[PDB]
Design a protein around this ligand. Sequence first.
Ligand SMILES: [Mg+2]
Ligand SMILES: [Mg+2]
Ligand SMILES: [Mg+2]
Ligand SMILES: [Mg+2]
Ligand SMILES: [Mg+2]
Ligand SMILES: [Mg+2]
Ligand SMILES: [Mg+2]
Ligand SMILES: [Mg+2]
Ligand SMILES: [Mg+2]
Ligand SMILES: [Mg+2]
Ligand SMILES: [Mg+2]
Ligand SMILES: [Mg+2]
Ligand SMILES: [Mg+2]
Ligand SMILES: [Mg+2]
Ligand SMILES: [Mg+2]
Ligand SMILES: [Mg+2]
Ligand SMILES: [Mg+2]
Ligand SMILES: [Mg+2]
Ligand SMILES: [Mg+2]
Lengths: 43, 204, 119, 98, 101
Amino acid sequence: GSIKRFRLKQRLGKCRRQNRPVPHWYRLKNTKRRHWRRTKLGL
Amino acid sequence: GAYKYIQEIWKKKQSDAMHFLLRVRTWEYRQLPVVHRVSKPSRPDKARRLGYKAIQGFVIYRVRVRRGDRKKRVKKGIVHGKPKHQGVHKQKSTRNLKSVAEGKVGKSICGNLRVLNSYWVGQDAVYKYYEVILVDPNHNAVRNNPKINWICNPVHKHRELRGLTSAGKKYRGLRVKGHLSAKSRPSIRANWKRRQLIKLRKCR
Amino acid sequence: NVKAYELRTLKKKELLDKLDELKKELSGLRISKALGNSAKNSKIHGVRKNVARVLTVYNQKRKMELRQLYKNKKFKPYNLRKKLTKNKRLQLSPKQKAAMTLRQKKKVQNFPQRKYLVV
Amino acid sequence: AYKPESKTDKKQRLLNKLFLKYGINHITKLVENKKANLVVIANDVSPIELVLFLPALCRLKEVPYCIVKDKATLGKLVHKKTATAVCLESVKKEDQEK
Amino acid sequence: ARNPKCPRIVKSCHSKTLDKYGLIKYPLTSEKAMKKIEEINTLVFMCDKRANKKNIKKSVKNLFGIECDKVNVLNTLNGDKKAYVRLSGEHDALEVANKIG
RNA sequence: GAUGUUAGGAGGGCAAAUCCGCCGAAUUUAAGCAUAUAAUUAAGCGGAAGAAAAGAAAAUAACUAUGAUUCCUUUAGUAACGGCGAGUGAACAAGGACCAGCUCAAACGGUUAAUCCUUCGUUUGGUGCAAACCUUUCGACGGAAUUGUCGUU
RNA sequence: UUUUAAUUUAUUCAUUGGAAUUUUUCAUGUCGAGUCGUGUUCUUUGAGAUUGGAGCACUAAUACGUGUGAUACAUUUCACA
RNA sequence: GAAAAGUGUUUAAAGGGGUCCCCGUCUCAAAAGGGAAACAGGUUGAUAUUCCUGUGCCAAUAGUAUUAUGAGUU
RNA sequence: UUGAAAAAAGGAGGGAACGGCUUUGUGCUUUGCUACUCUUAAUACUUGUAUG
RNA sequence: UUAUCCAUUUAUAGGGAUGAAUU
Ligand SMILES: [Mg+2]
Ligand SMILES: [Mg+2]
Ligand SMILES: [Mg+2]
Ligand SMILES: [Mg+2]
Ligand SMILES: [Mg+2]
Ligand SMILES: [Mg+2]
Ligand SMILES: [Mg+2]
Ligand SMILES: [Mg+2]
Ligand SMILES: [Mg+2]
Ligand SMILES: [Mg+2]
Ligand SMILES: [Mg+2]
Ligand SMILES: [Mg+2]
Ligand SMILES: [Mg+2]
Ligand SMILES: [Mg+2]
Ligand SMILES: [Mg+2]
Ligand SMILES: [Mg+2]
Ligand SMILES: [Mg+2]
Ligand SMILES: [Mg+2]
Ligand SMILES: [Mg+2]
């Protein structure tokens, strides 16, 4: 909830970062997305 | 000559003088911690006859082992399989008590050292007491000396744990050569494997 | 853009000074990036590389100095020692392995394995 | 008086080029060979066994033995920290009587 | 008391531990930070995750003509520390903002 | 004997196909099942190496005798074991691969431990651009060691 | 580049030390004990009055000894270790 | 105990307090038990007993030397 | 059924120890003079940068 | 009784005749 350990917080942040979509410019030279409600991080 | 004399003395064992000594010594050992360093061999001659030398890196450790069989390890006395395998209590171990003694010192207590050998020292009804001769393979005194040097090699890590010490050789049945021991030689398991082996031949 | 061959000749203080300047520049670039700019965003990479180069040069100089300081003297720091697979380090030196008990040596000297051409 | 040479003395001798004999193994050999004339044994050794046989042996071989109080003192009598026994086979004529 | 004949491990390399450049990474824009700069002379800096308040203060002192009364920090969910730095009354954050960029 | 963040070192964990120790089942087969069988297997626990283990006879033969170990071809599905049921089951010899022998202990040397190691050194070399290595013999100052090091067989 | 064969050049002078055989004397030495072994238990083996191992009890002999020679034993050869 | 593990003063030479004596397993286990100290108003698109203004509170605060503040002693 | 513990704090009992400066002899003793022992707060200066 | 075993404590004086208690 609203009191995390630092490690957990960092993990959450990491997950969030992972979430974001392919930078579109790359496509000129993703399947692991997760929606917070349907698939859990299972931490 | 001296060592011959002490050999002869120790052969007697049940003779009054020797008996008294044994009684004292075993009593003393009963008190000390189960595995503990000793400064000098208690049986110098016997130590010598094994591998012992008064070189810097050689150490003797006195070790105590409980006597008797080891109950078959099972939660409660009950075993769940066929009757042939059902008994506990008269289950005698394949290893010698001597082997056990050397194992316990060699393994976690003196992982640094290399077990060379071990000799008998004393016994009561509860415990057998062995002195185990060990050697520090990193001490240069041992590294340099060409006889003994061998033990510095990495193939001799934990000889005691692979049944390669004299006691190990005994219970592997490599002490007996001949028709009496045909079935165990390169190793019992190895022999078994060999005997099982089906060799086919590509051509056939 | 400063490549190493120029920097080897420089003294350590000078190198340090250079490095600090480079770092400052990098910081400036970062600040610019953070603010709404993309003018010299691509300049940063080069600067970073330069910094790295400088660090490398200085580090090697330092190592050399250390080596010079601890030349011989039996024991040394474990860094400046021969970093090498543990087993190898443990292992007996070839000479040690060779070393023969005196009688054996004598025997070898006397009756060496001869060459003898059979006809 | 009959101390053995110390390292330095030995070195000097080597350069230039009757005493107490020690060590139980040597001493037993000596006694077995009727060479020894007096053996002096320490009171306490950690395995008593390493020396127990010795006085009996002496009694058989008709050689004089005496058990002396300190191992460390015996060692001192030579150049070692300790010593089990010490033997004098031969002696200088001026002292033989003693 | 130790007296080693030589030390065990001697890192001859330049220190890896974070200097001013590396500790404090960049100021924040964003409307919030701009507002802060305007109204209450507080400069917002993104910093390394392993910056302390003391450390941040030191960095600020070194990197700019800044004296800081108080520094609040927080760990962002992007793996950066955001340090809110309130300047002493002698300084105008706006002027210092201008100076920095 | 404890004690030391004393000086120097070592062990610990990962990995496992082969390998070495233990520990150790049962399904299964027997048309049931209980000894047997599965199997000295699986799992478990520990330990090594480029291989491991074994190895220089307290060996086999009964010959005109062989001669460490290992492995292959065989002996042999034989001798033997076995509710003599199911099933299990070697060894010697023979033919090869490969072939290597040894050192402690004990005996001997006291007109002297000759041994051994730590630290500090000293000065010829060799390859290297350096880094490092490689060897060379010479002392000291320590210790260790006569409860036994070294040489001799 | 790696090494390891063949081939090419050794010749003078120093002496400490060791080795092998060969004579001839004299020495008949030493040879691993709670170990082997037996009993008994359990295990393992093709091993059968127990193949190896182990626990326990008892516990040896000195080379003319002790150990193998696949049936328990005695009395004794012989061979091999 | 073959180890893996199983037990935790059972026969220990088991770090603190004073000026040698005197104490004495270690460590984790409470975001509802124990416990140093905070309130109000304001402010943001999204934070606030956490920022702002104001007003306090708690715990530190090494030595040496001045200052002041008061006590006590002559 | 009688209803946690400890950190931490406090109080009491007890009476260890006892001014400062200057001079002499081997921390201790002797000789001579009167601002002293506390106490908060501020200030200054060296000591790693002495407030969260 | 010395092995062994059990207990007890800070291993605290060798055997007999509703205050304080420490340097
Ligand atoms: Mg949660
Ligand atoms: Mg859900
Ligand atoms: Mg079993
Ligand atoms: Mg915070
Ligand atoms: Mg390991
Ligand atoms: Mg069936
Ligand atoms: Mg069926
Ligand atoms: Mg059925
Ligand atoms: Mg397995
Ligand atoms: Mg091998
Ligand atoms: Mg075969
Ligand atoms: Mg056939
Ligand atoms: Mg079978
Ligand atoms: Mg023999
Ligand atoms: Mg079976
Ligand atoms: Mg036969
Ligand atoms: Mg806690
Ligand atoms: Mg609470
Ligand atoms: Mg809200």
